[PDB]
Write a protein that binds this ligand. Structure first.
Ligand SMILES: Nc1nc2c(ncn2[C@@H]2O[C@H](COP(=O)(O)OP(=O)(O)NP(=O)(O)O)[C@@H](O)[C@H]2O)c(=O)[nH]1
Ligand SMILES: [Mg+2]
Length: 316
């Protein structure tokens, strides 16, 4: 009645977000006290996001739409220290709001594939009035949107369908992959996460490596590892929401030069799925269970995980 699930995938693929969803779906969510613990994370993520955009403006040579923002940028650094401690004054919120609304800042934001920017930047910056409110308490979605790369191994437990799940989460950044092997024993199923929207991005560890290519190499290694022959391989093609928006404006040929389909979700998503599934060297004896997901969407993850659990029960 015990099931061990191991989450694998490159950095930023959404592994830890899936972990959070298990608590929300099967453990009644994050309590008020638990949500408050994420307040400083939300504020830090928010401040780091606007700062990253401002830093990129210097690198890409983008001016502020309105010269008055120069002073707001100065004040941002003077007041930024508070956010990290869990405090968001009306003054700091005002500074961030004006910067976020600037046309130059927006021009830079829309060129984020050229630098490293948290996926939840817009989510938080567009909700400044709410998160800056007095006595602000992060919502479940706010918690799901937080970003903190995983170092070490995280173990979570929950019950579902009369089964006791033991979920293991590890970091996917290059420096953390050496630790994956510590979790290789007795795995019932591997949930390998892939950020669909990574197709036109490069690794933060190396700007010369395409993120999706890196993910493919990792999947090739895991899926074909003889050690996992009897371990169910679940493939989560994640960030489908970001992918749907991006495929409309950024050519998939950046990642796959041979792609001949249109700049639409269905054709492009199916193509990527085929690229990953084709890495399977034993197609007749090893099955991959693929699901398209939006890890921050609780309803999507609930239905997908329900489907995944059924396969695990029937196969293992
Ligand atoms: N829009 C969107 N954001 C997502 C999705 N999945 C994850 N994110 C966001 O992407 C960021 C990174 O997610 P996270 O789960 O930390 O990634 P990870 O694979 O655990 N990273 P690491 O390997 O470094 O530990 C978070 O801010 C999270 O909220 C998705 O499907 N859509
Ligand atoms: Mg993580």
């Amino acid at each position: 009645r015990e099931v061990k699930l191991l989450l694998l995938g490159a950095g930023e693929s959404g592994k830890s977000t899936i972990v959070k969803q298990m608590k929300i779906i099967h453990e009644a969510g994050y309590s008020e006290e638990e949500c408050k613990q994420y307040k400083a994370v939300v504020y830090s993520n928010t401040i780091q996001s606007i700062i990253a955009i401002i830093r990129a403006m210097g690198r890409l040579k983008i001016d502020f739409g309105d010269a008055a923002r120069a002073d707001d940028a100065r004040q941002l650094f003077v007041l930024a220290g508070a956010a990290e401690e869990g405090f968001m004054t009306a003054e700091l919120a005002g500074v961030i709001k004006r910067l976020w609304k600037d046309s130059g800042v927006q021009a830079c934001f829309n060129r984020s594939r050229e630098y490293q920017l948290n996926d939840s930047a817009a989510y938080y910056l567009n909700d400044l009035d709410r998160i800056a409110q007095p006595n602000y308490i992060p919502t479940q979605q706010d918690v799901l949107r937080t970003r903190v790369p995983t170092t070490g191994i995280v173990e979570t437990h929950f019950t579902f369908k009369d089964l006791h799940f033991k979920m293991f989460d590890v970091g996917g950044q290059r420096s953390e992959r050496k630790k994956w092997i510590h979790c290789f024993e007795g795995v019932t199923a591997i949930i390998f996460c892939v950020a669909l929207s990574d197709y036109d991005l490069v690794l933060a560890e190396d700007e010369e490596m395409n993120r999706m290519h890196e993910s493919m190499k990792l999947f090739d290694s895991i899926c074909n590892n003889k050690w996992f022959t009897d371990t169910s391989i679940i493939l989560f093609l994640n960030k489908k929401d970001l992918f749907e928006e991006k495929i409309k404006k950024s050519p998939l040929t950046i990642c796959y030069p041979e792609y001949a389909g249109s700049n639409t979700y269905e054709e492009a998503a199916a193509y990527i799925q085929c690229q990953f599934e084709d890495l399977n060297k034993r197609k007749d004896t090893k099955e991959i269970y693929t699901h398209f997901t939006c890890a921050t969407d609780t309803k999507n993850v609930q239905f997908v995980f329900d489907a995944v659990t059924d396969v695990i029960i029937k196969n293992n």
